[PDB]
Amino acid sequence: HTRTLGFILPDLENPSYARIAKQLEQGARARGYQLLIASSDDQPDSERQLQQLFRARRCDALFVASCLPPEDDSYRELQDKGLPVIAIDRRLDPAHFCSVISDDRDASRQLAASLLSSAPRSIALIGARPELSVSQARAGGFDEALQGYTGEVRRYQGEAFSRECGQRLMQQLIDDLGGLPDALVTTSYVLLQGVFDTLQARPVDSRQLQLGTFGDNQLLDFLPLPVNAMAQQHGQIAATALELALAAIEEKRYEPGVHAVGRTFKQRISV
Amino acid sequence: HTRTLGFILPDLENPSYARIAKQLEQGARARGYQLLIASSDDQPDSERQLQQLFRARRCDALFVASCLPPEDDSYRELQDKGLPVIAIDRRLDPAHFCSVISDDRDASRQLAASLLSSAPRSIALIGARPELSVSQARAGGFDEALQGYTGEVRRYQGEAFSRECGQRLMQQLIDDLGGLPDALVTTSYVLLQGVFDTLQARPVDSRQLQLGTFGDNQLLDFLPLPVNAMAQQHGQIAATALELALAAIEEKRYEPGVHAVGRTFKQRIS
């Protein structure tokens, strides 16, 4: 026993992971545990390197937002050797791992529906890493809200949750529609940032779409362009994950399954 | 040789530290090293517990943005035991420790001057943790820039670099002046967040003022209100800090002193 917990996350610059990591560290500290954080940069080989690191380090439990393929069984190996693995944000196999996540599919359905109110002629989804369960959920909720929709629908899912990817996809979208869509949902705030870059390159008067995104940002309150946002309850995510970790460590309780926490709706678009 | 580096930082939610950590991680990986990150919350006792951690992990080198007093010699002991300790952002005793920091005094001078050039009738500084060298440098630069200025000046220094502190300080400032200051410098983007919270509560027509800050954010480009920003050169700081780490680990050379890296001026105010 080391009384240390590890957290592998995809991106240190993603404010949601930072917030969760901070909430975890605080809660852990009150329980007598230290938190060690490492970033995979959403690269599968980096994550595998971190796996070996946290195993040799002998952390009492490992929190992880994985970027690995579901076919990969590396975490099963670690678990079989006695390491408690708690998934965060990105679910691991519900038959073998405990995961704490946001209720993304329903969040996405409401998000898209909130834009559909204005009767848009065209609507698009911009996302990334389509293979991930988190991405499938958000694309899934988006489709669900489109039932009975007769307008133009486009889905663009890039290679990374990055600003530049969002910028590239927005361009490709604009180039493909011959203009802005009436409405747009981004599956991640960082992707929205790229969208803003693309919009800024255009003349001032062609930038008036209905916008919705996952995650949130304070400065959205000051944007002339209103953006609806679905934010994580980071505090509850961390508190749930930690309690699950400690039960596995201290009570040897561990039940596979997904624990979903609702997102909060931040509406800035007048309805 | 564990092939792992440690990084102790004050605040995971502070974009400046997250950026440097990310760059350090990326740089370390290219040299065959893994980076483990931990947060102190700027709490001295939390930081001390973390010391034991990278003490036990036996990391090859430890990066740290410390919140400990100058009287505290805990880092001295760790160094004597053979651990390369590299300060980042917050300098440690230049007589014994190597530190990579930003050119804060100069940056703060230029930042404040940029606001003064528009002839404000009042100007304020919002900062935190006045005892820190980084805070003295930024407050000092502000003061140098204001030499000869005959308008109203206010200096509010809070207890933490946090959004809530920034909010409280902005509230006290507005009550003090009986309104918004014409110009304002915040010593940390995190404090600026709290300032933005206070402005948000005011009518849309009552949010105009000359604004300058350390740190930066993309959306600052899109606001109807331009904000001058002194961005940290996160990549350069990481590279320099990394170079010093490896030179210590692999070549045993360790030379105390301060390596200052200049900031990037985003002059959004015409």
CATH number reported for the structural domain that contains residue B153 in this entry = 3.40.50.2300
Q: How far is C-alpha A196 from the chain's CA centre?
A: 19
Same domain? For A85 and A109 the reply is no
Separation of alpha carbons A122 and A111, rounded Å: 15
- Crossing angle for the helix pair B104-116 and B133-145, nearest 10 degrees? 30
Task: Work out the end-to-end distance of chain A between its first and last CA atoms, rounded to an integer number of angstroms.
Answer: 55
Q: CB–CB of A57 and B53 under 8 A?
A: no
Report the C-alpha gap between B264 and A78 in whole angstroms: 45
Domain hosting A21: range is: 1-95
Residues A128 and A156 placed together within one structural domain of the fold: yes
Q: How many CB atoms lie within 10 A of CB B176?
A: 14
Residue B213 and residue B248 in one domain: yes
Do A85 and A135 lie in one domain? The reply is no
Q: What is the CA radius of gyration of chain A?
A: 20
If asked whether residues A83 and A212 sit together in one domain, one would say no
Distance CA B248, CA B133 (A): 25
DSSP annotation of A263 reads P
Residues B102 and B30 occupy one common structural domain: no
Residue A218 per-residue DSSP state: G
Rounded to 5°, the CA angle B261-B262-B264 comes to 135
A159 contacts A165 by C-beta, under 8 angstroms: yes
Domain-ending residue, one of B71, B95, B119: B95
**What is the chain B residue with the closest CA to A8?**
B36
Q: Do B42 and B153 fall within a single domain?
A: no
3-state SS, residue A213:
strand
Cβ within 8 Å, pair A13-B12:
no
Q: How far is A204 from chain B (nearest CA, A)?
A: 11
- Rg over alpha carbons for chain B, rounded to the nearest Å, is 19
For residues B149 and B170, give the distance between their C-alpha atoms in angstroms, rounded to a whole number. 22
Q: Which of B4, B9, B12, B209 to mutate to test the interface with A (most CBs of A within 10 A)?
A: B12
Number of compact structural domains in chain A: 2
Query: Is A18's CB within 8 Å of B12's CB?
Result: yes
State whether A25 and B38 contact (CB < 8 Å). Answer: yes
Same domain? For A101 and A120 the reply is yes
Cα A210 from Cα A226, distance rounded (Å): 8
Query: Do A211 and A125 share a structural domain?
Result: yes
Look at B224 and A224 and tell me if their CB atoms are within 8 Å. yes
The shortest CB-CB distance from A217 to any of B4, B38, B219 is to B219
Residue A83 sits in the same domain as residue A129: no
Nearest CA in chain A to B221: A200
Look at residues B95, B122, B145 and tell me which one is the last residue of a structural domain.
B95
In angstroms, the CA B182 to CA A238 distance is 41
Given resolution (angstroms): 2.0
Q: Which of A102, A57, A51 is nearest to A72 (CA)?
A: A51
8 A C-beta contact, residue B122 and residue B156 = no
The maximal CA–CA distance of chain B, rounded, in angstroms, is 60
Greatest Cα pair distance, chain A, in angstroms, is: 61
- The torsion angles phi and psi of A64, rounded to 5 degrees, stand at -150, 135
What does the block give as tokens for A113?
């529906």
- Terminal Cα-to-Cα distance of chain B (whole angstroms): 53
Q: Are residues A101 and A151 in the same domain?
A: yes
Residues in A touching B225 (Cβ below 8 Å): 222
- Contact assignment for B36 to A37 by CB distance below 8 Å: yes
**Mind spelling out the 3-state secondary structure of chain B?**
CCCEEEEEECCCCCHHHHHHHHHHHHHHHHCCCEEEEEECCCCHHHHHHHHHHHHHCCCCEEEECCCCCCCCCHHHHHHHCCCCEEEECCCCCCCCCEEEEECHHHHHHHHHHHHHCCCCCEEEEEEECCCCHHHHHHHHHHHHHCCCCCCEEEEEEECCCCHHHHHHHHHHHHHHHCCCCCEEEECCHHHHHHHHHHHHCCCHHHCCCEEEEECCCHHHHCCCCCEEEEECCHHHHHHHHHHHHHHHHHHCCCCCEEEEECCEEECCCC
Provide the CB-side half-sphere exposure for B150 (13 A, CA): 0
SS3 content of chain A, % helix, strand, coil (to 5): 40, 25, 35
Last residue of a domain, one of A68, A95, A122: A95
CA dist., res. A14 & res. A37, Å (int) = 14
Q: Is B29 within 8 Å of B2 (Cβ atoms)?
A: no
Q: Considering only CA atoms, which of B5, B82, B86 is closest in space to residue B38?
A: B5
Cβ–Cβ under 8 Å, residues A80 and A74: no
Same domain, A146 and A212: yes
- Cα torsion angle, B18, B20, B21, B23, sign: positive
